[PDB]
Amino acid sequence: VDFKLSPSQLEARRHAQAFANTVLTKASAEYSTQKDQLSRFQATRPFYREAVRHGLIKAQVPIPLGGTMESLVHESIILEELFAVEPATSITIVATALGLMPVILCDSPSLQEKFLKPFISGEGEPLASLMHSEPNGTANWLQKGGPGLQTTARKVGNEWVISGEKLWPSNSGGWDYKGADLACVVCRVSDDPSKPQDPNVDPATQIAVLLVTRETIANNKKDAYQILGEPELAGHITTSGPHTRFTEFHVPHENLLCTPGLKAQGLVETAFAMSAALVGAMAIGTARAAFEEALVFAKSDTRGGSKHIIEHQSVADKLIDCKIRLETSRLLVWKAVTTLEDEALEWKVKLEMAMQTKIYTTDVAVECVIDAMKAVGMKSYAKDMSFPRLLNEVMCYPLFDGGNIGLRRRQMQRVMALEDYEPWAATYGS
Amino acid sequence: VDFKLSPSQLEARRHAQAFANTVLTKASAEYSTQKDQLSRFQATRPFYREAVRHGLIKAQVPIPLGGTMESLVHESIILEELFAVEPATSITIVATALGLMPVILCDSPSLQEKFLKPFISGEGEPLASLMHSEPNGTANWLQKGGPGLQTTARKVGNEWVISGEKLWPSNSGGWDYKGADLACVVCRVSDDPSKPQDPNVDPATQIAVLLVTRETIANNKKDAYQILGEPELAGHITTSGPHTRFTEFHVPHENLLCTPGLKAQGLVETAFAMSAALVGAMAIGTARAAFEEALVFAKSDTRGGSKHIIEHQSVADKLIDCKIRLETSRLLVWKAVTTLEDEALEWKVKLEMAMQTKIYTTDVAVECVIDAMKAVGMKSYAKDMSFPRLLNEVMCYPLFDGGNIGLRRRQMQRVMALEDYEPWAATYGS
Amino acid sequence: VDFKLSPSQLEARRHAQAFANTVLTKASAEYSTQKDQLSRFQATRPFYREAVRHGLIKAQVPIPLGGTMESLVHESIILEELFAVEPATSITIVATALGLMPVILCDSPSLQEKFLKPFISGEGEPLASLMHSEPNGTANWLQKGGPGLQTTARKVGNEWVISGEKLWPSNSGGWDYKGADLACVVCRVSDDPSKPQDPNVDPATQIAVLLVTRETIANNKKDAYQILGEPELAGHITTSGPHTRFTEFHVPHENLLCTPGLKAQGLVETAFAMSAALVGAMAIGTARAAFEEALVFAKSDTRGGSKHIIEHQSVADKLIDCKIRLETSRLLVWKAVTTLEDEALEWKVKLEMAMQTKIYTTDVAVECVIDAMKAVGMKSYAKDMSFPRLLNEVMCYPLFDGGNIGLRRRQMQRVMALEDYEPWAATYGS
Amino acid sequence: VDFKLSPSQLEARRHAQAFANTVLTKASAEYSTQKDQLSRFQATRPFYREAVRHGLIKAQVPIPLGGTMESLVHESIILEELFAVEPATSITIVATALGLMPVILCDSPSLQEKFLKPFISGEGEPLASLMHSEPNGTANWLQKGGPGLQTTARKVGNEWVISGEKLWPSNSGGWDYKGADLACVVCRVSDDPSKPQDPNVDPATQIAVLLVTRETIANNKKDAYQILGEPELAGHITTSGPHTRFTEFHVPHENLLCTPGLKAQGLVETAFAMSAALVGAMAIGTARAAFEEALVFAKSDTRGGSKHIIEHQSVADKLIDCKIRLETSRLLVWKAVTTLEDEALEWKVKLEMAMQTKIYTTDVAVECVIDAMKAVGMKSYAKDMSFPRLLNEVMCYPLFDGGNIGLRRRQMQRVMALEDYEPWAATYGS
């Protein structure tokens, strides 16, 4: 076992850091004063443009597919550096990565060449979105006997017809509400959308992914694709993840990502398992920003006393707890993404490790930001410090990318209950 | 022993609830459109006006002093109901209460009659502020051999001259920055403010409290009293707690609250111990709003599954944990205020109980809000629910009113380290 | 609302302290030499004798039934003092009180007069046991479609015949394995014990409680009642709670406690709700002993340094956290038992409060003992301090008297999920 | 960056597992029948003899020094597997590794060759001990102005004379109270032991380490070396760590480990920093045994319900938290030991990483055992399961090898407060 970073991993860090410090630090003056989420997202477009120019979207796509992604550990180091400075734009890049993952993972090389083209060009501001989440919730989307996804699709001729609503998926409506450049829309196949999901058939066997582009939306009637709203978020105030309604929305058969059923559900689960692992890097960045701000403050401020506050044991204890949470978190992320890259390990081992990672890093990042605030004291509550923004941003992580309580813990639980469960297969082999 | 509420405690609660729902619910539509903190505080003036007409400012003063305060348990009940709905204006009421407290507690009936007069009238919108906190911190203000308070006072003729800065004290500038109707300014006596505090004298013997009114301010040169800034807060966005600088600010000797030294420190300690106990009620109201909103959601929503999510054990575990935190918090607050009202008990015992109460309720209220958010899941993160506001608001409580890490834990540690410490004296007697 | 203790409550405390210090402190010299659990329990008989002589068993029976119980708050005070010194014998008293409860609370005065008689006499060493728990578990005993209790009973002529096994019920075999003086055996009614519980039935409608005395056991064949074993416990090493098998055990119909079904389940639920509330006083006593030992150590020992260890913030922080856990725990126990006593409150309100109390106090007692050990440090790990015993004893509390995870949380969850659940009914009526 | 185990790491694991399962499982049948700590420890001798025969003591010594230690990752894997089964004898091996470390670390090949010889022979049952800890404590041994170590040494011609007492050091009295085969006795140099440590000299400049063998002890008068007692421990009930008194105890100058002062303090600090990282693997072993026992239980028992208990969300939540604690702990240990072996890294970077590791792994192991017990429920409390032993054993870890509260957190705080502290130097370099 080895924890040393290669020259390309150190360069990936230096590059990410330089981009964050020279480009992302300027985003706040653009977005900070806009009234609504969409406006804030739009104000972020020149920074995404720069990220594309710096190669950061091309770096979300594997080299075999014409991108420049070197590894998932490189990706982890990049995301930690970006999120330690500014989640604006950084969040857009990862949302796009998620949006691309089903195509990156699928088994059609002609689909990959066609739909990944804009994202490896190094030009423009192309957005992708994995459109899974819904107004009524998704924690129970695979539950045999329940209503399932309320976004359904039916084959009519040589096309599919989507009806229903999505809520929350990042970048889904694009910069201007005429659509992401690529959206992977996750649907439940229902030949008749009025009738409930058949409780005698496993929900996983009825999943289909349909690829929707700006062209697709332009080819439909205006009322077939409507953005009904844009949630105002506590933190990550510059992301877009709207309420979208498809009404009789036609999509050509060639845009069907794969065979409906277990293969499609598989692509989705895989994409979301990879995000589960990497989301820990974002939480680390946010929490690391809080720790470092509190640390510098505790090593330079006496708070009207005779020594720097880090010399009070209760202050150092908080800082120690923060530092520990960050160190364990990062190791767990690097373990997770490395596990995901291991061809030897069966999927359930990868999936359990990804779930653990998401659950731990996100929950623990919140504690880290709060302890940092408690250590700095009253000054952390004013907006001339970063903590108000970090507090709001950090609370997103346990909730999003599949919340810990409803999705990730239950995905991990299902794995642990299986008869052939091997708790240590990722470490000690099978 | 008994927890039944008297008819007048029940009436205080009905009155508080009616006030909250007829008046305080309208505040948000007024303060929400104001871009800066002072303006938000100013938009809140008509609601404080209504608070005064409803008798709520008069109820912060004991009956023997012309007020209508029935008891601290009545107060605890009122504060919980107000803060469960809207901390805007509610926070102003309690900040005024704290400003009044050094006067309420002092042994001079002439000062009490004079300076409490506007607060017991039922007219206007009179504000009071206890001005203790400073830019450089206050956790170490009584540390022997340290710099001490940087707001100092010196006697010159038949007046005192205040030099230095305060930061954070609620209401201290009034509605218009010409001053609170009553400010208790806490100073360190120093004949020559350019000289450090003398390291061989106990800081507590150099504390003075000087009463500064609007008239005091108007009797000084314009540049003798100035507001340098108004912090933009993460939550409690409608409160004012400015950065104030006194420069050669003259106060009559008749305005000195009491003899400088241990008597003055003692009045500040007592005031802040009473607030330590009652700040729990504010934390309970906020956390209670989060718990109730999560409870109703959990009972009303299936999240696309086969049953309401309260029926999931992980969801119920969060709700159970919130409920336990709230229940234990309320009990401890009522214990602490009843203990403060007990004439048979020594100060050290009351102080220890008040510290415990502040530490427990405020730390635990934060966990209550966060767990509530986790239970609700993603929808908790959007501002169509109340959680974004509650999370920002709840994080104030561990930090303010004497932070838990630097001030309240240290005060309690000091009492616990005394040779005659009796842990259980508030319960089982001495 | 009032927390002040009456003269009789203070006397109850004094009496309980004097008993624990002059009698219970001598127990260890006797049980300590005994190599198995039963023999340790037997070694404890002379101390239970003394407890009876001091009126402590009589104090577990209400005055209208010939006992001397003053109130549940008196009971809480007695238990805290007892368990602060020595859980040996204390645990027998409390287990007997649980065994008496179904008879104390039943609607048959003839059963009360006959079966409580030995317990109000003030003589001998009479034991009672509520025999509910089983080798296969009881967390799911009321699960519809589940196997239910494996101890069943059937009516044959003018008798009931019991088949199956119990495990864990305190005192159940008596001093000599010829039986407790009174055992309430909870059975599921089944005319054929080889047949699985009907999945269509509500399991609570099948419950019967049969009273079994030493004369009942003697009236049966010797192999109809056998003790198969006695668990060797991590702590509470002097308690007995054996593995008992009933094989065609005949009981007179006049020993049926009440109408089978909902009424019988209700008596058991009520007895265990009462124990849920009071078990916190035992947790508090154990945790309090750990806190006070650490506190005395922290204020007298420098650990080879220049100052008492309580002077170190990290140490003081552990002690503060223990103190707060103990203070909140006692308040919650007093609230719970006062709630149970309230004639005007509905059952589910009482039950919910009792569940909260059990969950909180027992979880938090464990943390209190462990934090106290960390504060004292390495010396806490050797048996010349009490912490090794306290750690083993405290870990009983979250697991016993209905475990928190499987029973108490799920009882509380069920009440919260009821359409008419009112969270603050025990405090703010309505 | 890589977590993959080499073939030799996998072989170390297999070999350690086979030794634990074939040899160590048999230990309990021998030590459980003995009446006190010493006897239990003595009953452990044949198992240590087997460990020596299987090369496990030789594997504590680096290959350059004639041992077989392959790497600290190898050692971590071995310790996790040993402590997962049986800490008896396992504890003796690690205590011997600690005892050897000051010699392994020193810069004197002639000392190394002489004193390490029995330990690399593969013969007998040689024991080492690092005798640091004392009756009065050691958390403040380096405190300037404090009393310091109460075990002192004075130079008398060509010999040193030791006065004072040790308490706790494992193996220090050997199998028979005639001494460990090698003890490294840490002393404070003092010409006159009746005089207090000079408050004007930095305690670390007065540290000496004297090597004491069985020959040294036999060459002194009988009353010069006395075992006064053997603590009865809550867990690890088969280790020896006696109370030793040196009275005018003569040691040859050629047995001095190095020049007294910073160099000697540095060997002690380094040895204890290496143990701090590795003790994590012991904590993991114990917690892993709890987790796996709870997991097997939860996957095979319904607890009288219809489904395996792991299907209940609150049970799964506990197992998930245990699993996460174990995964993060192991990563942190492997990171910490790999950091210690990195010659490019400054000592303070290694030290910080080792303290973090000790703090985290030992605190969290306790939580893991307790969670596992709560998940299993009542049955976990009886000695037919492993948990009573594991609970007592896991509580050792945060207290021993320098407790977290008094020692490790203070050592880490000291590093963090340094002006040139680089928090991430172990991951991203300097």
Ligand SMILES: Cc1cc2nc3c(=O)[nH]c(=O)nc-3n(C[C@H](O)[C@H](O)[C@H](O)COP(=O)(O)OP(=O)(O)OC[C@H]3O[C@@H](n4cnc5c(N)ncnc54)[C@H](O)[C@@H]3O)c2cc1C
């Ligand atoms: C900034 C941001 C970016 C996002 N990016 C995307 C994106 O790119 N694509 C996309 O599709 N979505 C995205 N989301 C949404 C998010 O990934 C999912 O909606 C969310 O994580 C799922 O919500 P939830 O887990 O709370 O599930 P919900 O279904 O909303 O359930 C909510 C709560 O109900 C409870 N619950 C429900 N069922 C159970 C159960 N069976 N067991 C136990 N508890 C249960 C749990 O407490 C759960 O937390 C984004 C959201 C945000 C804020």
Ligand SMILES: Cc1cc2nc3c(=O)[nH]c(=O)nc-3n(C[C@H](O)[C@H](O)[C@H](O)COP(=O)(O)OP(=O)(O)OC[C@H]3O[C@@H](n4cnc5c(N)ncnc54)[C@H](O)[C@@H]3O)c2cc1C
């Ligand atoms: C909405 C609001 C209302 C307020 N109302 C008032 C008011 O009416 N009047 C008023 O005067 N102020 C008021 N305040 C200010 C507040 O009461 C105090 O400034 C704040 O509670 C004290 O800050 P602190 O406890 O963080 O101490 P600081 O001195 O700022 O110390 C900050 C941190 O340093 C550490 N620290 C410092 N010294 C030590 C030590 N010796 N040991 C351990 N740790 C230490 C702790 O981590 C502490 O949290 C208000 C503030 C707000 C936001």
Ligand SMILES: Cc1cc2nc3c(=O)[nH]c(=O)nc-3n(C[C@H](O)[C@H](O)[C@H](O)COP(=O)(O)OP(=O)(O)OC[C@H]3O[C@@H](n4cnc5c(N)ncnc54)[C@H](O)[C@@H]3O)c2cc1C
């Ligand atoms: C000293 C002592 C005295 C005792 N006194 C008595 C007495 O007087 N009378 C008596 O009858 N018993 C007595 N007991 C036994 C004890 O009250 C119960 O057996 C125990 O509290 C119930 O066990 P449990 O709660 O762990 O349930 P179990 O049925 O053993 O369940 C074990 C675990 O399975 C899980 N589980 C099972 N079902 C669910 C579910 N539906 N949801 C979630 N999790 C689940 C939980 O993690 C639970 O902890 C005593 C025991 C001791 C040690």
Ligand SMILES: Cc1cc2nc3c(=O)[nH]c(=O)nc-3n(C[C@H](O)[C@H](O)[C@H](O)COP(=O)(O)OP(=O)(O)OC[C@H]3O[C@@H](n4cnc5c(N)ncnc54)[C@H](O)[C@@H]3O)c2cc1C
């Ligand atoms: C099985 C076992 C094996 C052991 N092996 C060895 C061995 O091989 N060699 C050896 O020498 N010892 C050994 N020990 C002993 C152990 O390493 C040390 O004595 C112990 O870890 C140090 O004790 P402590 O950390 O509790 O410090 P203590 O000095 O005993 O301090 C006790 C407590 O006081 C408080 N405290 C003291 N000073 C401060 C401070 N400055 N700041 C904050 N809090 C403070 C802390 O709460 C601390 O926990 C062993 C013990 C056991 C049980």
